[PDB]
Amino acid sequence: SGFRKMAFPSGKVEGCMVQVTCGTTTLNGLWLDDVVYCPRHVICTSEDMLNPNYEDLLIRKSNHNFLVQAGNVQLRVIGHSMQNCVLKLKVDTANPKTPKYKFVRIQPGQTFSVLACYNGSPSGVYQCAMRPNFTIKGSFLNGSCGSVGFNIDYDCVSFCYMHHMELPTGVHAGTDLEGNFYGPFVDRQTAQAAGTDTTITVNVLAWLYAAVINGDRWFLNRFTTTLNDFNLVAMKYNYEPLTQDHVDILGPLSAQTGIAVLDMCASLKELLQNGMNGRTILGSALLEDEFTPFDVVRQCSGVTFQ
Amino acid sequence: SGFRKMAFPSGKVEGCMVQVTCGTTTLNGLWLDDVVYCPRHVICTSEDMLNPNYEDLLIRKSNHNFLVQAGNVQLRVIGHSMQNCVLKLKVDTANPKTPKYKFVRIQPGQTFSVLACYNGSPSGVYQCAMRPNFTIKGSFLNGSCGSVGFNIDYDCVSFCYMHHMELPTGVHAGTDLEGNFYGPFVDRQTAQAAGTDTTITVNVLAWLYAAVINGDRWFLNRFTTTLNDFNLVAMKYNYEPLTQDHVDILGPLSAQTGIAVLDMCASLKELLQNGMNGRTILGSALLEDEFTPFDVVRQCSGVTFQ
Numbered sequence: 001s002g003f004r005k006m007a008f009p010s011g012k013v014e015g016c017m018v019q020v021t022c023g024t025t026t027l028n029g030l031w032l033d034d035v036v037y038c039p040r041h042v043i044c045t046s047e048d049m050l051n052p053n054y055e056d057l058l059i060r061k062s063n064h065n066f067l068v069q070a071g072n073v074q075l076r077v078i079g080h081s082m083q084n085c086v087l088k089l090k091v092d093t094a095n096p097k098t099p100k101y102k103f104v105r106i107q108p109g110q111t112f113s114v115l116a117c118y119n120g121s122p123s124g125v126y127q128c129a130m131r132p133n134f135t136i137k138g139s140f141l142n143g144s145c146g147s148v149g150f151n152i153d154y155d156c157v158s159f160c161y162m163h164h165m166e167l168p169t170g171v172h173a174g175t176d177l178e179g180n181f182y183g184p185f186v187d188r189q190t191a192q193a194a195g196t197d198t199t200i201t202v203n204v205l206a207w208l209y210a211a212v213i214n215g216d217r218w219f220l221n222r223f224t225t226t227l228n229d230f231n232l233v234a235m236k237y238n239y240e241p242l243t244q245d246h247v248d249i250l251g252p253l254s255a256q257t258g259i260a261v262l263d264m265c266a267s268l269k270e271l272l273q274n275g276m277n278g279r280t281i282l283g284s285a286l287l288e289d290e291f292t293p294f295d296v297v298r299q300c301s302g303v304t305f306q
Numbered sequence: 307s308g309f310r311k312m313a314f315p316s317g318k319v320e321g322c323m324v325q326v327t328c329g330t331t332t333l334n335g336l337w338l339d340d341v342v343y344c345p346r347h348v349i350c351t352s353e354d355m356l357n358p359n360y361e362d363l364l365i366r367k368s369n370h371n372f373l374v375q376a377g378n379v380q381l382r383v384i385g386h387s388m389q390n391c392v393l394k395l396k397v398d399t400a401n402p403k404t405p406k407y408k409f410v411r412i413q414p415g416q417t418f419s420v421l422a423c424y425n426g427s428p429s430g431v432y433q434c435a436m437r438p439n440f441t442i443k444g445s446f447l448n449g450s451c452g453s454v455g456f457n458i459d460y461d462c463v464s465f466c467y468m469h470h471m472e473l474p475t476g477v478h479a480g481t482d483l484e485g486n487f488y489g490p491f492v493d494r495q496t497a498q499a500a501g502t503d504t505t506i507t508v509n510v511l512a513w514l515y516a517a518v519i520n521g522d523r524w525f526l527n528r529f530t531t532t533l534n535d536f537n538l539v540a541m542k543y544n545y546e547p548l549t550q551d552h553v554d555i556l557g558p559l560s561a562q563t564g565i566a567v568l569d570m571c572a573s574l575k576e577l578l579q580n581g582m583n584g585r586t587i588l589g590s591a592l593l594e595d596e597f598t599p600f601d602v603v604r605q606c607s608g609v610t611f612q
């Protein structure tokens with residue numbers, strides 16, 4: 001037993017991280033088959049970033065201006081192209097460590113593991129969630145751009161995130177691996193509004209089922225509620241509206257535990273209206289929303305990969 | 307910026323995980339050079355575990371009774387031996403994926419990454435701390451025994467923990483890689499007292515420096531205190547006594563931030579006497595103690611490995 005914020009094993013992704021240098025800028029790239037993917041702002045100077053014309057800036061660059069280093073190994077760049085906000089550098093060597101992979105665009109409220117990297121070398125791994133406002137709350141220093149987020153299905157790595165920027169707040173923004181930003185953000189250094197975030201209600205309920213499964217329980221009340229009634233409480237507290245689809249998704253956890261979803265919402269309702277009284281749940285004094293229902297099923301099922 | 311509970315990249319350890327089967331019992335082993343390490347209770351039946359005589363039970367076993375499977379690959383066992391609470395199975399093939407490694411016995415309050423595994427296959431990775439009472443608070447289901455904890459120094463993996471058991475509480479106990487339990491625990495299924503845990507004061511202070519570095523600050527007060535005065539407050543609140551050694555260890559963080567350690571203790575004192583008023587620090591409503599001072603320096607330094 002026990003319940004932890006758990007990241008996927010990162011070995012399959014470590015084998016794909018490379019270093020990309022263009023002039024003065026060095027960041028991380030993702031090497032799959034004979035293509036290296038990286039943020040297109042690798043071609044910007046410190047001045048270019050306030051208002052870059054990426055097409056015009058890219059035209060000044062040739063294949064030999066992109067230095068791609070894999071460990072100490074040295075890739076020859078033989079073509080380059082921009083796709084949305086990512087550059088694709090064609091190299092003359094296919095990555096022998098390429099895992100079975102896919103590119104996916106995840107939905108807000110979903111989770112994924114981040115392999116934070118500097119100079120092409122992995123530094124650490126952590127889990128998080130795509131916020132309803134399409135930011136993530138990560139740990140990214142200077143040089144971390146091009147670090148990727150991902151999920152693993154047994155053998156197959158689904159890449160879903162590439163890091164591009166930090167906002168004047170400490171939250172982070174980036175793209176899918178086709179280069180389309182999550183959310184309204186653009187890759188220039190100008191003020192950018194994330195907008196109101198909300199709490200992922202279906203994830204909080206899944207965590208409450210995780211808590212019940214691990215013996216923590218004081219919160220299980222006595223009450224029940226309705227979907228429309230609970231949703232009134234959700235809006236007062238900036239929670240995402242709970243749908244029937246969310247109820248169906250929680251159907252494995254409701255049946256393993258024997259607790260109806262709307263009963264659990266009545267518990268959550270009282271949590272939101274009364275606080276925690278200085279108690280804790282699964283070792284937290286806050287309501288946790290970065291575990292999906294599938295994260296919980298996985299966690300207490302022992303699903304492995306590789 | 308940002309600050310996250312971050313695990314080491316696990317690729318070097320993934321390459322060492324194997325499956326060990328003895329009769330009915332299957333668990334994980336750690337394959338380094340031509341030796342596989344695993345918990346010795348792999349030789350126990352469900353009945354043996356209430357009161358095992360490990361020497362007598364081991365005598366009934368021969369090399370061919372240990373089935374070691376590496377992925378699908380098949381290792382020949384050519385010797386076996388007990389060292390404290392671990393078995394060492396000599397195999398006829400050295401692991402080609404063996405990293406530079408060391409076996410270390412960590413101190414309470416230190417941290418390490420756990421690669422949780424089932425049937426020899428990695429499932430997830432998370433960070434934690436050796437509690438002052440020599441337990442860990444992990445996520446371990448049936449079959450997870452033999453999963454290992456570790457730290458990485460650039461190239462070198464320092465293995466420090468192997469999982470053996472859960473206690474009737476949801477906390478976890480295990481050994482170093484020489485088979486000596488952390489804490490007073492034994493490998494039999496009988497009631498076992500963990501004893502009072504305490505909070506790792508030097509780790510909480512490091513986290514408060516992490517918070518200050520990341521803009522979170524409302525807690526920085528006005529007061530100062532003395533080492534003896536603060537230590538009076540530590541005991542009332544089950545905190546480990548702060549030593550001068552702890553003060554010296556916090557010397558990088560005090561100088562980066564410009565805040566004297568005893569000033570930070572005065573802040574922590576007021577936190578302990580007044581609560582959080584429903585505020586949060588680095589996204590937590592509790593005082594976090596599973597980051598070491600070096601975890602913080604690393605985290606906001608961008609140190610990489612491999």
Ligand SMILES: *[C@H](O)[C@H](C[C@@H]1CCNC1=O)NC(=O)[C@H](Cc1ccccc1)NC(=O)[C@@H](NC(=O)OCc1ccccc1)[C@@H](C)OC(C)(C)C
Binds near residue numbers: 048050166167
């Ligand atoms: C790449 O390695 C690096 C990682 C970030 C640095 C620290 N944490 C990170 O995640 N990213 C950057 O430096 C990018 C570079 C860039 C982006 C777009 C075009 C050209 C170059 N920039 C940022 O992360 C800035 N974020 C940003 O521009 O947000 C919009 C903005 C900027 C300025 C004022 C208002 C709004 C970061 C470094 O700047 C802030 C947001 C102040 C942290």
Ligand SMILES: *[C@H](O)[C@H](C[C@@H]1CCNC1=O)NC(=O)[C@H](Cc1ccccc1)NC(=O)[C@@H](NC(=O)OCc1ccccc1)[C@@H](C)OC(C)(C)C
Binds near residue numbers: 452492
């Ligand atoms: C190995 O894969 C497995 C992992 C644990 C199962 C669930 N979470 C885990 O971490 N471990 C075990 O099953 C070991 C097996 C064993 C241990 C010693 C000798 C022989 C076999 N046992 C345990 O984890 C038990 N813990 C335990 O015995 O603690 C002492 C005790 C036992 C009974 C009553 C009082 C005290 C677990 C499974 O049992 C409890 C503690 C009730 C959770």
